[PDB]
């Protein structure tokens, strides 16, 4: 219950944090965003939350998605909503340990 | 004595473990064989 957006766009998120909960795929995992068993979306890197539309391409193996995707109007393609976390720090830095 | 008796029993059981696992792996293989032995190997054979 209480499915919704736990973190809104622009917020400084720390790793592991949960961004949104959903019974069905209202949003899809984006960049540096993980997917949970229950389909909740959590931050894989500390950063800033960003929502953006993007084209949807499914795994070749799944029959339902390849069939639906294939049977689309040549002109255009369907889209989806994605959630991304923008990493805000470098992985690490080099420091002087000792002079020998 | 308890530890040695505990250790030795594990060693004997573990020593024979590969053979038993192979057998268990073997059986399930034949079990599945029978599944397709008639699902397609015989049932469809007549459906031709």
């Amino acid at each position: 219950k209480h499915y919704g957006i736990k973190k809104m766009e622009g917020h400084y998120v720390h790793a592991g944090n949960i961004l949104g909960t959903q019974r069905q795929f209202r949003w899809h995992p984006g960049a540096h965003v993980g997917l949970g068993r229950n389909k909740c979306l959590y931050a894989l890197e500390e950063g800033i939350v960003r929502y953006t539309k993007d084209v949807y391409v499914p795994n070749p193996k799944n029959t339902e998605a390849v069939d639906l995707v294939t049977s689309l109007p040549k002109g255009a393609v369907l889209y989806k909503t994605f959630v991304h976390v923008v990493p805000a720090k470098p992985e690490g830095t080099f420091k002087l340990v000792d002079m020998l | 004595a308890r530890r040695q008796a505990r250790e030795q029993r594990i060693a004997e059981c573990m020593a024979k473990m590969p053979q038993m696992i192979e057998n268990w792996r073997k059986q399930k293989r034949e079990r599945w064989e029978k599944i397709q032995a008639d699902k397609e190997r015989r049932a469809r054979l007549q459906a031709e």
Binding site: A15, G30, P60, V69, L96 | -
Partner: protein, 315 residues
């Protein structure tokens, strides 16, 4: 219904990829994160097509292509354009010349001699150990006669003290034509000295087109120079001084890790203790400690402790 259907995953995939690159009103991931020559080419193609043996090998999937000839052809025909990218990729342009881009033209060649006829070609992005580069390499670029030139070696990333700097391993000046022994040795050759645990330092070999003989007295260095501090150098200032008579025409860069020879360089001639660097990550994030960590496991108290040993205070 009027429009046809893709009927193939590949056709949809290619269409989707192109659309993402195109700009859009809505936010997207990318925002946040002559004639005679042609006739000659066609004639060769017809000759190759006419050859039955070539067709026979192709239909037998036994044919092969000589990489050696293609490599030479690639360098002459379109190699510089690719060479420009690998310079852009590594950021050479955005570092040496503050974002100015110069297309390389001369197919410059460098190789380090190892004992005997086993030359290590220094291409773009190659990996060369400091040990091999102990001595200066052979440079050949077919300058042709009556062709003044100048050669420069630079490490880009270094200068332990100064971040925005770049040492000059050696600068030959007034190089007349292909031959390089005639260049004025403004700076002797220093062996590569990438500090331990500092990653991959990228070294580049750049050549400028020398219009008129200019004495680089302000650039000459006391030979031998083992006072590393003096090797401080920044291309932009140097090029700006001589930009009138200096225009770059060649590139060649390798990246090298630390090696035992580096210890020799720091001690024997640099005459100083070698620095050691280690990759240090920031400490992990913990929410502010609470007096009552409700519903949190016993591990909670360990997260905020400094010493792993017991203390006894007044006891």
């Amino acid at each position: 219904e009027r429009l046809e259907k893709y009927r193939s995953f590949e056709r949809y995939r290619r269409r989707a990829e192109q659309e993402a690159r195109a700009p859009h009103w809505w936010r997207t991931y990318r925002e946040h994160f002559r004639t005679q020559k042609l006739l000659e080419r066609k004639h060769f193609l017809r000759e190759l097509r006419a050859n039955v043996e070539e067709e026979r090998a192709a239909r037998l999937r036994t044919a092969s292509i000589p990489l050696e000839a293609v490599r030479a052809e690639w360098e002459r025909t379109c190699g510089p354009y690719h060479k420009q990218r690998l310079a852009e990729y590594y950021g050479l342009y955005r570092d040496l010349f503050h974002g100015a881009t110069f297309v390389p033209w001369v197919p410059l060649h460098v190789a380090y001699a190892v004992g005997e006829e086993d030359l290590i070609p220094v291409y773009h992005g190659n990996e060369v150990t400091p040990t091999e580069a102990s001595r200066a390499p052979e440079v050949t670029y077919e300058a042709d006669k009556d062709s003044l030139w100048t050669l420069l070696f630079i490490n880009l990333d270094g200068h332990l003290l100064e971040p925005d700097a770049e040492y000059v391993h050696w600068l030959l000046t007034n190089i007349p034509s292909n031959r390089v022994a005639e260049g004025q040795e403004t700076c002797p050759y220093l062996p590569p000295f990438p500090a331990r645990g500092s990653g991959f330092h990228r070294f580049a070999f750049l050549l400028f087109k020398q219009d008129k003989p200019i004495n680089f007295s302000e650039d000459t260095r006391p030979s031998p120079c083992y006072q590393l501090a003096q090797r401080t150098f920044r291309t932009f200032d140097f090029y700006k001084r001589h930009q009138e008579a200096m225009t770059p025409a060649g590139l060649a860069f390798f990246q090298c890790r630390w090696d035992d020879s580096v210890t020799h360089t720091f001690h024997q001639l640099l005459d100083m203790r070698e620095p050691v660097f280690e990759f240090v990550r920031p400490p992990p994030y913990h929410p502010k400690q609470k007096r009552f960590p409700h519903e949190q496991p016993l591990r909670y108290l360990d997260r905020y402790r400094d010493s792993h040993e017991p203390t006894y205070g007044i006891y």
